[PDB]
Design a protein around this motif. Structure first.
Motif, PDB file in Angstrom:
ATOM      1  N   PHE A 114       0.822  -1.203   0.000  1.00  8.14           N
ATOM      2  CA  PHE A 114       0.000   0.000   0.000  1.00  8.14           C
ATOM      3  C   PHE A 114       0.859   1.257   0.000  1.00  8.14           C
ATOM      4  N   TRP A 115       1.929   1.258   0.809  1.00  3.73           N
ATOM      5  CA  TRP A 115       2.769   2.453   0.884  1.00  3.73           C
ATOM      6  C   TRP A 115       3.221   2.894  -0.500  1.00  3.73           C
ATOM      7  N   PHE A 153       2.103   1.729  -3.434  1.00  5.83           N
ATOM      8  CA  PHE A 153       1.045   1.830  -4.426  1.00  5.83           C
ATOM      9  C   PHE A 153       0.368   3.187  -4.401  1.00  5.83           C
ATOM     10  N   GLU A 154       0.453   3.923  -3.294  1.00  7.16           N
ATOM     11  CA  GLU A 154       0.028   5.322  -3.355  1.00  7.16           C
ATOM     12  C   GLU A 154       0.874   6.105  -4.362  1.00  7.16           C
ATOM     13  N   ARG A 167       2.398   4.782  -6.816  1.00  8.05           N
ATOM     14  CA  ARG A 167       1.979   4.264  -8.114  1.00  8.05           C
ATOM     15  C   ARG A 167       0.745   4.991  -8.626  1.00  8.05           C
ATOM     16  N   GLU A 168      -0.205   5.283  -7.739  1.00 10.15           N
ATOM     17  CA  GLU A 168      -1.377   6.051  -8.146  1.00 10.15           C
ATOM     18  C   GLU A 168      -0.971   7.421  -8.663  1.00 10.15           C
TER      19      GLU A 168
END
Ligand code: SF4
Ligand code: SF4
Lengths: 176, 100, 364, 144, 70, 318, 156
Positions: free
Chosen positions: C102-103, C105-106, C108-109
């Protein structure tokens, strides 16, 4: 030109040996990772409150195709079939006949949203800015058949979204 | 009778839940859904047993500390612990602790 | 074939995602064929687009404009950051870390937002095309990329804090998947797989393609050829990609973003709407497409997962005769069996993670 | 202390939503109890708020109307309920709200936005838009 | 934010607090406002039995003091 | 009224388990920059109810077709033992006061493994049987250290009576006396409860669902409740053993509050650990116990035997 | 009728329970899995809605066919669908899964996952943006909310 990851030799002095023995016995690195997770716990979460909050998008976004009209109201598409040719997934089926007024118009314009790849072609090919992928993305359907759009569906989408589509084109038409 | 009551109540509660979870939701109408290697590493399990025996032998120690012959008690307790450590060391060095 | 938890034999069955891409390419024009390469490797779309663009340009004997090349290198490094984030984070997830997923992938967004701003698609864009880039960067994007990059270092450092020195993480990867340098070379491995073993080969330096000759970066090299060394290499390569991104941000040239040849790159909308020549060329380009001189070429780039190559043969028509895609994951998955010998199931999961395999690439 | 300030800010949130009842209303409907500047309201009843202090992605939000196009939307809300004019402001496509920069007025543009109609009697049904291609011979009505 | 986690923790805290307070107050109620006597050794149980006999109501917690004497 | 006390122990513990699920979800989300369940009820308080109802209304699949008696006993045994292990704990007055409540809890924990042992076998699958075997080994391996560490620390208590732990730690926490033992005991609790980084049993990333792969709807819910109840109970045992609390005899509420807060802290630590570290490899798990921990526990056991004698601090038996 | 009222409230309860706790299965074939993970990513985190990824098909309630469904992969997809307990819902994500998408005319591609398993919600896009997927999931939740199982049972 090249950098060596690893390839480092630990010191053998008593202080360094004591430090590494402390790390092994007292679980220092594990505690550091734990502290990192704790800090992330106290940091503000990044979640947006969908559907009440929406993710950012740019004017060039590629979504639901929408046939547009001229300001007079006449449909822009002039049955060039250029879109069908560039279509990389053959999701565009176009049929045309001279209409009663004598203009070159499309009797059939079907975009199979189940075969289309949302490439953005056609929007960049149509010489009259007819088909323009609209900003809408939340057009999921409960049946497969609803996603096989018709010329009536495309024109209704264009009429529905023209206010936003014209503004987005105005924003981006200079870059194109 | 208190411990017996507690055991009965807990067992009955858990079994009641198992009933309401195996039969009560099984009523809901549905349809048809159709539908070992010899572990030689079991030696670890066997060694646990012989170590659990020493575990049992060591449990009396808190009351053993109350004797007047504390010298003999300490010598024998450390004797048992050192024998356990020797057993562990033997199995370790002879690669007997081949876990998985 | 597992004796206890030990893998005696690891046999990869692929084709569960074979979509006949190469066959379908033969029936499409080159511009129509470009979107497939975005799909080929879903994590590193723009890199595949760049590889195909280089192939078609080389066959075309046409040279992209410099600003297009610098945009291409910038987004190639952005794509490399995305791909490495996915590879390292999903490997960590598979071995149980779960939080760096998640860390990162933010971030990545946010990089997907950059993709959306340039092309309108969060991923699988058609930005990089033969002859250059489709559209110039929207105003204000470069400074936003600066804002993202100036803080990305702290995020990757936090990932290292979570994983690099963790005892459990080292135990899961310190010596699993060891590959000899000669074995790695023979089995056709590329990218980190080679560099993890210690051989010094990066196509960006050895055979630079676009503007990598004008940028400065250090190729991370490993010493023990294990999963942990590959992890270290991937993390460092991300850091060097951030450095390259800074360099590209500083020295982006002004000018055109596509070749000033209307027989290859489509004319501008105003020009096609005002000039007969431009309209004729637009019509033929978006209906027939551009004929490529007959020939064959194998063009390779250092894609984030390794060497990505396209063997493109042209018959002189507007549709390629044969297009063979060299996926770096193909050889890595082939050598997976050799790597897995003498290891346990969990080690097999770790090895699968270390060979960053995207089965769109493998199956094509 | 700052903790007292945060508690007072929570109390201000309670007051700003119209009292405890409005606070609970917005909490149950939207799960967010922030108070922001009301940029405007569409004809359908959706209210649009902006709080530039919040980080990007939460600076703009919409409270969907309880009733739209003859549907009770107190609990069931959907993204399609956003009219196109406010859609671009909400999704950060533009920084100017429709009230500040009205969209161009055209006759063909719809006057009432319809939400996603899938699963409803208004759902789109595909059909061919071309007439019959081959015309069959009509037999004569006389016996001979 | 992170304070949103707190309400669930508070509900769990109350649920965990309930049994201990319940046990303490039930012991107080059953043993006449005093803690339940702890008999870990037979001597203490003998004392409890003697108190039961002395009480006259067959309840040990009932305590007879100097008043019973003479 | 004793039955009333039994219910007061049982039902609130189950409610605490239900809300511990939500707490775990939200904490893991926030440590991953996410927000836990918040749509279902105010701040997500109604999520466990939805989860339970969804589970119960779900189809009761059962392709076990072997020793269905066992396939039903395993959930019963697990839940019953999870509820029972709470009984001897003094908070501050125990429901049942045993001279040997500690050994009782050890025996109940050892028995609780049979629930995993049978469930996996009666499932008669591949992952289920092998995963169940890995479970036996895991719990069995750490049961040894658990007992040794427990014996070593109780050498200061002077008995296996849980209640006297409050008296022994009246002036200071026993963690100050036996922190190495405390660390090893905490890791041991983690292993015994089959929690990450030792979540090898279920091991979703490696084994599709482990021993409960063939358990669905209610029986899966009972396994989940047993798991979480064991987590809370083991953390409570840690809190009583090491992080002692002040007990005013006239106001037990103060001790109850302090104990509950410490147990909550330890459970949050469990969730925190689940979020941070990856999972130990089955082989590495055993290597950490028999080869690394077992030794140090033996040395510390010798030391904790010797210390009261050489410091004349033998605790009173009564 | 009172019986109808009780049945309606019970059906509301069960529908609310099922839609609030939707457990999709970790099933991603092609590119659309990436956007699915981005839905699971913090920005549009699905866990807020009660959406939790659970690997076990037996412990899962919704199947998201995120990717191109090849002829080789189709029997496995059908098997995993069948092993999934009911009520079960299928959400098709991506043009490839909906109707074949880019590879519709491929010899090795099943032209839509509707041919193999029934589909409840079709999410257009290639890839569908994570927001579009979240919208499709919420539409599925509304569809569950509209279900009238107990009402139909009482009407018989
Ligand atoms: S976006 Fe879709 S419809 Fe338009 S050209 Fe591309 S594949 Fe065809
Ligand atoms: S629809 Fe597009 S993104 Fe999804 S699997 Fe197919 S090609 Fe990939």
């Amino acid at each position: 030109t090249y950098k060596f990851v690893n390839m480092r030799e630990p010191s053998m002095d008593m202080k360094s040996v004591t430090d590494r023995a402390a790390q092994t016995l007292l679980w220092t690195e594990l505690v550091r990772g734990l502290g990192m997770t704790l800090s992330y716990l106290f940091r503000e979460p990044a979640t947006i409150n969908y559907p009440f909050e929406k993710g950012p998008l740019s004017p060039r976004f590629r979504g639901e195709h929408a046939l547009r009209r001229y300001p007079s109201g006449e449909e822009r598409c002039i049955a060039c079939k250029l879109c069908e040719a560039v279509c990389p997934a053959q999701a565009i089926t176009i049929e045309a006949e001279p209409r009663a007024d004598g203009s070159r118009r499309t009797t059939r314009y079907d975009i199979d949203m189940t075969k289309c790849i949302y490439c953005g072609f056609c929007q960049e090919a149509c010489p009259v800015d007819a088909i323009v992928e609209g900003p809408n993305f939340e057009f999921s359907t409960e049946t497969h058949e609803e996603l096989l759009y018709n010329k009536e569906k495309l024109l209704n989408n264009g009429d529905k979204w023209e206010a936003e589509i014209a503004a987005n084109i105005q924003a981006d038409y200079l870059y194109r | 009778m208190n411990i017996m009551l507690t055991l009965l109540t807990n067992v009955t509660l858990a079994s009641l839940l198992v009933l309401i979870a195996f039969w009560l939701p099984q009523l809901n109408a549905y349809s048809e859904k159709t539908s070992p290697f010899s572990m030689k590493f079991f030696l670890v399990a066997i060694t646990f047993l012989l170590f659990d025996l020493e575990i049992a032998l060591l449990l009396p120690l808190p009351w053993a500390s109350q004797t007047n012959n504390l010298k003999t008690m300490l010598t024998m307790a450390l004797f048992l612990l050192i024998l356990l450590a020797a057993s562990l060391a033997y199995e370790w060095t002879q690669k007997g602790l081949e876990w998985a | 074939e597992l004796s206890g938890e030990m893998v005696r034999k690891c046999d990869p069955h692929i084709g569960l995602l074979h979509r006949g891409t190469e066959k379908l390419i033969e029936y499409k024009t080159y511009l129509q064929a470009l979107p497939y390469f975005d799909r080929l490797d879903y994590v590193s779309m723009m890199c595949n687009e760049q590889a195909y663009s280089l192939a078609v340009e080389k066959l075309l004997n046409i040279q992209p404009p410099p600003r297009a090349q610098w945009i291409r290198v910038l987004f190639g490094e952005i794509t490399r950051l995305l791909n490495h984030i996915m590879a390292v984070t999903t490997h960590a997830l598979d071995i149980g870390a779960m939080t760096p997923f998640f860390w990162m992938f933010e971030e990545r967004e946010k990089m997907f937002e950059f993709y959306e701003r340039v092309s309108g698609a969060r991923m699988h864009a058609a930005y990089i095309r033969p002859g250059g880039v489709h559209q110039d960067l929207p105003l204000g994007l470069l400074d936003d990329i600066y804002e993202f990059s100036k803080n990305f270092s702290f995020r990757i450092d936090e990932l290292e804090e979570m994983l690099t020195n963790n005892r459990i993480w080292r135990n899961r990867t310190v010596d699993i998947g060891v590959v000899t340098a000669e074995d790695a070379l023979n089995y056709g491995f590329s990218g980190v797989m080679l560099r993890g073993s210690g051989i010094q080969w990066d196509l960006r330096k050895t055979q630079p393609y676009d503007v990598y000759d004008q940028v400065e970066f250090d190729v991370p090299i490993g010493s023990r050829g294990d999963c942990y060394d590959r992890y270290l290499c991937r993390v460092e390569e991300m850091r060097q990609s951030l450095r390259i991104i800074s360099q590209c941000l500083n020295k982006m040239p002004p000018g055109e973003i596509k070749v000033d040849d209307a027989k290859v790159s489509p004319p501008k909308r105003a020009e096609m709407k005002t000039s007969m020549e431009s309209l004729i060329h637009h019509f033929k380009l978006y209906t027939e497409g551009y004929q490529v001189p007959p020939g064959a070429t194998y063009t390779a780039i250092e894609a984030p997962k390794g060497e990505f190559g396209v063997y493109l043969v042209s018959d002189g028509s507007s549709r390629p005769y044969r297009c063979k895609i060299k996926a770096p994951g193909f050889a890595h998955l082939a050598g997976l069996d050799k790597m897995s010998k003498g290891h346990m199931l969990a080690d097999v999961v770790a090895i699968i993670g270390t060979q960053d395999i995207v089965f769109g690439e493998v199956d094509r | 202390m700052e903790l007292v300030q945060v508690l007072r800010r929570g109390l201000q949130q309670v007051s700003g939503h119209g009292g405890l009842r409005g606070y609970l209303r917005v909490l149950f409907r939207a799960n967010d109890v922030r108070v922001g500047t009301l940029v405007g309201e569409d004809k359908y009843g959706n209210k649009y708020y902006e709080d530039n202090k919040q980080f990007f992605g939460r600076h703009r939000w919409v409270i969907y109307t309880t009733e739209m196009n003859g549907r009770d939307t107190f609990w069931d809300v959907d993204g399609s309920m956003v009219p196109p004019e406010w859609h671009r402001w909400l999704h950060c496509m533009t920084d100017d709200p429709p009230t500040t920069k009205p969209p161009t007025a055209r006759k063909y543009i719809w006057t009432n936005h319809k939400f996603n109609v899938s699963g409803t009697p208004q759902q789109y049904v595909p059909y061919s838009t071309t007439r019959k291609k081959i015309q069959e011979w009509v037999p004569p009505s006389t016996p001979y | 934010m992170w304070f949103e986690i707190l309400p669930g923790i508070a509900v769990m805290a109350a649920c965990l607090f309930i049994p201990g307070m319940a046990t303490a107050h039930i012991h107080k109620f059953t043993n006449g406002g005093k803690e339940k006597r702890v008999a870990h050794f037979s001597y203490q149980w003998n004392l409890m039995e003697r108190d039961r006999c002395i009480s006259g109501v067959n309840r040990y917690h009932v305590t007879k003091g100097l008043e019973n004497i003479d | 009224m004793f039955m009333i006390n039994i219910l007061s122990l049982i039902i609130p513990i189950l409610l605490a388990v239900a809300f511990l699920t939500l707490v775990e979800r939200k904490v893991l989300g926030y440590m991953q920059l996410r927000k836990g369940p918040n749509v279902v009820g105010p701040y997500g308080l109604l999520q466990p109810i939805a989860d339970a109802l969804k589970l119960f209304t779900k189809e009761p699949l059962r392709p076990a077709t072997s020793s269905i008696s066992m396939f039903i006993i395993a959930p019963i045994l697990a839940l019953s033992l999870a509820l029972t292990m709470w009984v001897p704990l003094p908070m501050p007055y125990p429901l049942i006061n045993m001279n040997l409540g500690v050994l009782f809890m050890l025996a109940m924990s050892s028995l609780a493994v049979y629930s995993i042992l049978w469930s996996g076998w009666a499932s008669n699958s591949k992952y289920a049987l092998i995963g169940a075997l890995r479970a036996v080994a895991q719990t069995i391996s750490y049961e040894v250290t658990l007992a040794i560490i427990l014996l070593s620390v109780l050498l200061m208590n002077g008995s296996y009576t849980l209640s006297t732990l409050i008296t022994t730690q009246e002036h200071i926490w026993m963690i100050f006396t036996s922190w190495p033992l405390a660390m090893m005991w905490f890791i041991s609790t983690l292993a015994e409860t089959n929690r990450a980084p030792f979540d090898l049993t279920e091991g979703e990333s490696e084994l599709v669902s482990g021993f409960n792969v063939e358990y669905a709807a209610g029986p899966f819910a009972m396994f989940f409740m047993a798991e979480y109840a064991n987590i809370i109970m083991m953390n409570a045992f840690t809190a009583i053993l090491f992080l002692g609390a002040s007990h005013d005899p006239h106001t037990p509420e103060l001790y109850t509050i302090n104990f509950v807060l410490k147990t909550l802290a330890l459970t949050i630590t469990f969730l925190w650990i689940r979020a941070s570290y990856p999972r130990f490899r089955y082989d590495q798990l055993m290597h950490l116990l028999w080869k690394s921990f077992l030794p140090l526990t033996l040395a510390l056991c010798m030391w904790h035997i010797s210390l009261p004698i050489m410091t004349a601090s033998i605790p009173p038996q009564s | 009728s009172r019986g109808e009222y009780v049945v309606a409230k019970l059906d509301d309860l069960v529908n609310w329970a099922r839609r609030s706790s939707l457990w999709p299965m970790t099933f991603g074939l092609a590119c659309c899995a990436v956007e699915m993970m981005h839905m699971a990513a913090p920005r549009y985190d699905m866990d807020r809605f009660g959406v939790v990824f659970r690997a076990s098909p037996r412990q899962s309630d919704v199947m998201i066919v995120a990717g191109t469904l090849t002829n080789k992969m189709a029997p496995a997809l059908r098997k995993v669908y069948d092993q999934m307990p009911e009520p079960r819902y299928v959400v098709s994500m991506g043009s490839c899964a909906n109707g074949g998408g880019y590879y519709h005319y491929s010899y090795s591609v099943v032209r839509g996952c509707d041919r193999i398993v029934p589909v409840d919600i079709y999410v257009p896009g290639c890839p569908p943006t994570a927001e579009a997927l979240l919208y499709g999931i919420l539409q599925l939740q509304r569809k569950i909310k509209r279900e009238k199982r107990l009402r139909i049972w009482y009407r018989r």
